[PDB]
Symmetry: C2
Subunit: 332 residues, 2 copies
């Protein structure tokens, strides 16, 4: 059966809210107490919109002290924006603070403006990401790595504190690139994806390639991790729930040319939206959304990461949490 | 009256302990509930010893959710090892998670091994720090700054989330360099210092330059912040308390040539370090320790330590940051927290 998790885009009620983490903690605590698998948090820079998490390790440390069982995962460390040493250090802090509940999905970045944080790392940043993942994994295990120090001497260092998990649960963030699904299987990593920029049919084929590459490289296919972000807002009445979600979700999908056109292409505008919310989101009733979960389960999705903070007002999202729990129970 | 705060070196019980933050949360919660002003957390890299905080913003975010009033401060953010943008971003997250309780002391770094994290930033790190503090302040205040993006284009960015505090409470980490005290006064910043490598009269002199530079540059003297790190272990029996702290503290004070020689020098002892044998160091370190706990630490009884607090209050110290995790076993440190509270009560 599919695992149910929460996912945060990073939104809050206002740029100048006194309680910017209102929905973050309300949802994470609710999910923690109701058998949800993980809470996913992002990395975003330089925009008020979606900006509560410029470094997910910092938010994760706070979630660790407010929850007891839920996994605390990054829906995406943009690795070329960090030194790999700091990624292991900070997430090992969170691993200790949470008694072993962290996981990381790694993304390469794409916006050169984000690389204000790493101005010499844009261009070959995808290659830099895969290199850094190997470093992150080695440091996490406890091995020494070799690095240049401040006077040009090569030194050997370990990262501290040591984590509690022997091995870092990790994912590769991907959209539709089949090579990346294959690379993830070669690495034994999971895949973290979405249905905004690929069809369900494209997803089914990409999962199959990923699981093929997993066994080809000796990993048990049970160790595969397929996680799909899905826009989520669940209620008791289908049409009323859809209408509450419509303006906030449309606003986002129209906010950029890429989002707008990646949607219309992955769907085959109010026309792309109506197909999107029916087939590639969890917006509706437990019963209507369960049909989507059934399709995703049948093509090999292990975990749905329910993006709940896409713009619907916080009281309504909080009121919708027992409806989302009902969906989870329907699908167990 | 002097403010009382806790300060963490970053130690924990064993390398693979499942409860590495045992004393961190025990002390932070205790201090939060007993009238302490702040808890200070460090930045340290590449060693288990003192290593639970490689980036203090992450630990600070957790302390924010475990405490209600205490300030949550870094002693120190080694600013040349960070992009200033990440410092404002991460500490603004903590400012929001804590309802406005953060503060930062900035250090420049000194060990080239730490600069594995910033391999082109060693050499210019003191000026990099001061330049970075100004960037941090501008960003905290909601200004845009100009930075080069990944394709060489200049762009104008703000940092998010926006903080809760209008202005960041900040300090400069300093030992005995008088120009740094004067520099801090020019910036209106605080100073965070220690007595491992200077005298109380040296500190009194450095404090005077700092307060003089403050009003010179238009700041109210009441805006000055003088915080002194002090090794701390308080108990009811003077002799037993100093004996409990002796081996842990002396192990630390002789763990490097600089630590040992700066201690011997600051305690007024005459030693030819080139002829000093292993047995000699035993006698010298014991003498240096004995002078140090008498004059420059909080290791003893509430009554004995209150004499030290009085001398610090007189020379203008605002806050003592009590370093409690220098190696005494954790249960004894926990049992010593109410003795430290008794000392705070005595001094208000």
């Amino acid at each position: 059966t599919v695992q149910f998790s929460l996912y945060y885009f990073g939104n809050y009620e206002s740029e100048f809210s006194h309680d910017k983490y209102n929905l973050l903690f309300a949802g994470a605590k609710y999910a923690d107490q109701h058998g949800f698998t993980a809470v996913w948090i992002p990395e975003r820079h330089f925009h008020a919109f979606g900006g509560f998490s410029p470094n997910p390790s910092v938010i994760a440390a706070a979630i660790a002290r407010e929850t007891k069982q839920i996994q605390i995962r990054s829906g995406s460390v943009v690795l070329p924006l960090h030194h790999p040493i700091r990624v292991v250090e900070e997430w090992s802090v969170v691993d200790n603070l949470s008694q072993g509940r962290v996981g990381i999905s790694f993304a390469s970045g794409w916006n050169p403006n984000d690389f204000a944080l790493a101005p010499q790392s844009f261009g070959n940043h995808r290659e830099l990401m895969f290199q850094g993942i190997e470093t992150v994994r080695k440091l996490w295990r406890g091995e020494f790595i070799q690095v240049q120090n401040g006077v040009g001497k090569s030194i050997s260092v370990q990262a501290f504190p040591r984590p509690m998990q022997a091995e870092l649960p990790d994912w590769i963030t991907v959209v539709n690139n089949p090579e990346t699904y294959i690379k993830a299987g070669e690495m034994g990593s999971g895949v973290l994806t979405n249905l905004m920029g690929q069809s369900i049919e494209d997803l089914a084929e990409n999962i199959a390639l990923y699981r093929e590459s997993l066994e080809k490289h000796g990993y048990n296919p049970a160790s595969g991790k397929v996680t799909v972000l899905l826009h989520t807002f669940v209620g008791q009445d289908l049409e009323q729930t859809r209408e509450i979600a419509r303006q906030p979700l449309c606003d986002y999908l129209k906010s950029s040319v890429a989002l707008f056109q990646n949607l219309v292409k992955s769907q085959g505008l109010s026309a792309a939206y109506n197909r999107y919310v029916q087939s590639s989101a969890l917006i509706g009733t437990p019963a209507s959304c369960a049909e989507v979960i059934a399709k995703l389960q049948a093509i090999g999705v292990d975990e749905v990461a329910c993006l709940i903070d896409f713009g619907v007002n916080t009281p309504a999202v909080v009121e919708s949490l027992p409806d989302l729990n009902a969906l989870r129970e329907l699908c167990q």
